[PDB]
Design a protein around this ligand. Structure first.
Ligand SMILES: Cc1ccc(-n2cc(CNCC3CCCCC3)c3ccccc32)cc1
Ligand SMILES: Cc1ccc(-n2cc(CNCC3CCCCC3)c3ccccc32)cc1
Ligand SMILES: Cc1ccc(-n2cc(CNCC3CCCCC3)c3ccccc32)cc1
Ligand SMILES: Cc1ccc(-n2cc(CNCC3CCCCC3)c3ccccc32)cc1
Ligand SMILES: Cc1ccc(-n2cc(CNCC3CCCCC3)c3ccccc32)cc1
Ligand SMILES: Cc1ccc(-n2cc(CNCC3CCCCC3)c3ccccc32)cc1
Lengths: 218, 218, 218, 218, 218, 218
């Protein structure tokens, strides 16, 4: 899929819109149902990552290390986009919209406040559907994992996705305004991750679940 | 000092180079003397922020909230800059250069690894002194404190410093490459901050030390 | 208001009864409503402290340090007094009376047990309205903050409030019986504070909220 | 030994001075030898409590509950007393005097600061050996354990020791000034206790060590 | 009761079935009611332990140390047996059967998953009522407490209970298949114990409650 | 290698003795060099497991899940075996023998106590080299990972290794005495594992290191 880096950006952007995960439903929900949602959020994030141009050109160890470090940034950014046309509320699924009271009552502690701060930041910018999928693929390529063996290759992927974002905005402040929301994206994803490490849902460390599903898809 | 935003970028950049904190010595060093260093690092980070064009024109409450959230990012970025012409070592002071073994022996736990990861990232870019002081003022203005009242006024400061960094690079990928290191900068400063919260050196919470010093300078 | 230290104690005691915070209502309550209550508990504790004779004669840094260390002892003691005419229940607001089951179900963990132990201690003494306001002003002046610069001045304030309590009980075991409940008051307030640090309600460290409101009133 | 409560205070005070634990040496010291010291500190605190007039006349369950809650207050107060004629240093043993740098190097974290704050407080009072041993027996009797069955019987012990301290000072502000240092004593002992719980020296919870030794002496 | 070690195993096994704790009811339940259940689970485990042949032949200090280390393994194994004839559910009391959703909603965090893993292990073996009571008495005698003074005596008790289990299965893989579930039993009991340490129900450390009740029965 | 399960136990035992990891040297040692040792311990534990008859015939996901849960049990048991002919000391490497004081100074906290308790337990049995390698392969097969798909296939491996240990002891209490040390082995390895999770050496979670190395060898 690296031919998409060689061609014009429009076909890359459209590929990214087509590889967007299928909208997920939760079916107030019981924890069993939220656990099922989480499980499918993991599978979906992995199959998506495999369809990012360049990602599969990294070795399996670096593909895993990259995903461990940023898989929750991909999810959080998904939740944040779907929540832009909303006010003080978060779209955790197609049939699950929760304010800060419903977030904490659904068992997410104080993550609502952290996620809404990220939403407001993206809302202050009129984040387009096309930018969102360029920003999301770039957040994945911007991994800073200490476990990465081939750094050059990861750097190359990120430069290409950076270029792609510049080539989109071309045909200069706009590109940077989106990148400047990335520090908060990482910080908010670390908070979500730390929450679910603490919960340890059904006896399972999130890291341990991600590795096994990455192993199935790799 | 906002007359520096309406002029040519050269006068702003040299002003930022002029308001850099005075080089700090530690005088292997005893904790007492490292405590003293930390105490002086706090003081100089505050007087420096006071000299950032725009900052002083926020309300005192927003100035404190901004600094609490990013004061350690400003510190960490200082340390990483002075470490660019080094290999696997960190310049914590003019007379304190420690490798990862020395970092952990001096009582910084595993932060050495976290700080080197950030150093490498800045080294893979040939980061220049002028880019550094613009990135540093932009890190301060990119605060995401939940305690911020006037978000429009913070955004405005952030935009002007973003513009100023764009105007520096003008006279397209360069500015964005520097911005893409900001998420790791936030993450690394959060680790450092959490370290010192847990240490609670001399019975004192770093937050409680910062506020009192901010008080005196405001 | 230090003229109240020079005159007879009766006018000091009546001043303390008049500067007592206005009774607060919660309106089983949603967390948003409990968060609102907490926010107003902070504002109210600050304006009260400013009306304690002597407190404003300390420098702003010592006023803040003193309040950080004891603001929750002031609140806890408020809750405890209002709960003396009750049995195994706590008056958290005018319209919020909770037993140990309602305390834990309102999200206070096991703080109910800690607060009821303090209540029983004060109940075993028939704590008068007048003693309560002398004991409360004395708990504030008895701060042991490591951040206090002018210790002598804090010591002076506490000696005066101690005298005032002795001058009240005069016109010797009675005064000490009240002071001997102070260790448990501090311990119970530390527990409450540690709870709310853990909760980190809406992304906010209690310390960080107190400093900003102290900044508004100072 | 309750015949000492019906007589003149002089016979009680000299009895308290006589039942002081024998001065302890540590023999910079290795952890093994500091572990040995701690082990002996526990033993002597128990035999001392056994010799407090009143204590032995509680049920065994209330004696254990009382000691668990305040055994470290008794220890800490010993250390602070022996440190009164010192400056910025603590007498942990007859042959172990450590400043704050030595305290942290010997593995006590930041407790040195907490203990010095308490020392200063006792030093600002010209605390006398006779006042010290009365305050110490009164700290023990001021327990607030949730596990206490006979609260009336604990209260009675506490009242008698309060009275005895009043009768000592008689033959008005002096007794109250000593009582006002008790909240910091509790707070400091809780910090020390939490330190050693987290260390869990040789696999052993301090609570579990105290109970077994209390068992042997009961 | 060591005559039961000298006679034939059938009388030992029948003694163990007769000293089994009386079935407990909870009466979805309020926490007060679950707290009452817990309190009675402690009393019952202690009186049971005193009726294990050999246990009382250990000194009081070793009886306590042994019980502290394994009392929750005894409870957990009780819960697990009663749950063998169930599917994905746990019998916490006679009138309390909860699945993983009801376990977490009753306030047990993720202990349901840990307890069901232990149940499945015991179910894969058709654990008999007679084996269960031999396995339970052997888990108690298999204590690995660092506080045990007379190790030989504890070792002797465990060897006898091991023999007894071999003499039962005689009149070789069967005995070991049961012993191989013991590592998971300890691990699951440590998890339960750590949960209740964190909860600190009504201000009480489980260890501190067990010691006082052991003191009543000893 | 399952042809070793259908033959006489002698060929299996000598195969287990042959696939023992090559003796490891550390070269008081610097953390860097202890980090290097740990890195090599992980590698050899993986290649060893690959050589356990049965293991390689699980799916890759079950192989990883099994190893994650018991890799540290395998390590710990190695260290305890090499420590049998020592007193109050542990052989962490061929050139690293540390007592409890040295263990804590080398940065292992209080794990020395936990490991010696396990050593004593194995020493009270005259544990032989042949029993050790069978117990070690059986510890691996006794995994209780919640992530295990094919529980029947793990059970089968476990049964065969149990049988093999029974067949070794044949050619009745001996096998069971070795199995009764497994609960302490799990508990001790969990403590060690939790230590290194908290240390997070060089920014790396042990789980994340194991998975990547497992990846390479699979
Ligand atoms: C115990 C417990 C189990 C499951 C969940 N839980 C799990 C999910 C799935 N989504 C995980 C993240 C949520 C934050 C944004 C990035 C993805 C969810 C969604 C909504 C409410 C709850 C909830 C929360 C708590
Ligand atoms: C107990 C203790 C006291 C003091 C310190 N300690 C404190 C400092 C001061 N600088 C703080 C940060 C260091 C990381 C990069 C951003 C600034 C320092 C510098 C070098 C070694 C140690 C050390 C560490 C531990
Ligand atoms: C998540 C969460 C949000 C808010 C609260 N919460 C906050 C308050 C306000 N009072 C704070 C302290 C409570 C203990 C006594 C000293 C003052 C309150 C009052 C009653 C119930 C709950 C509750 C608790 C938990
Ligand atoms: C691992 C470790 C083992 C032992 C100790 N350690 C143990 C003691 C014994 N005294 C305990 C308290 C010390 C604080 C005041 C109340 C009594 C001690 C004394 C001096 C230095 C160290 C140290 C600290 C750390
Ligand atoms: C706050 C809180 C109070 C009380 C309880 N709580 C306490 C018990 C009593 N049993 C304790 C263990 C439970 C796990 C298996 C071994 C025994 C119980 C039983 C069922 C649900 C809850 C619950 C849980 C949480
Ligand atoms: C910071 C730090 C780095 C490395 C180590 N550290 C790491 C190792 C390697 N072995 C890990 C376990 C040790 C306990 C028994 C099972 C294997 C080791 C060996 C001896 C001393 C220290 C030490 C400890 C602490």
């Amino acid at each position: 899929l690296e031919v998409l880096f060689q061609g014009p950006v429009n076909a890359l952007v459209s590929h990214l819109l087509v590889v967007e995960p299928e909208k997920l439903y939760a079916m107030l929900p019981a924890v069993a149902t939220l656990s099922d949602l989480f499980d499918r959020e993991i599978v979906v994030t992995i199959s998506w990552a495999k369809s990012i141009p360049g990602f599969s050109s990294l070795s399996l160890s670096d593909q895993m290390s990259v995903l461990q470090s940023v898989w929750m940034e991909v999810l959080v950014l998904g939740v944040a986009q779907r929540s832009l046309p909303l006010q003080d509320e978060l779209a955790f699924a197609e049939d699950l919209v929760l304010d800060e009271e419903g977030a904490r009552a659904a068992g997410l502690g104080e993550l609502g406040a952290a996620l809404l701060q990220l939403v407001r930041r993206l809302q202050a910018l009129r984040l387009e559907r096309e930018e969102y999928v360029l920003l999301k693929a770039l957040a994945l390529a911007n991994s800073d994992s200490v476990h990465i063996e081939d750094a050059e290759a990861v750097e190359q992927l990120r430069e290409a996705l950076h270029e792609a974002l510049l080539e989109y905005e071309a045909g200069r402040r706009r590109a940077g305004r989106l990148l400047l929301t990335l520090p908060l994206l990482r910080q908010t994803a670390g908070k979500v991750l730390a929450h679910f490490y603490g919960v340890k849902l059904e006896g399972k460390v999130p890291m341990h679940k991600l590795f096994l599903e990455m192993l199935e898809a790799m």
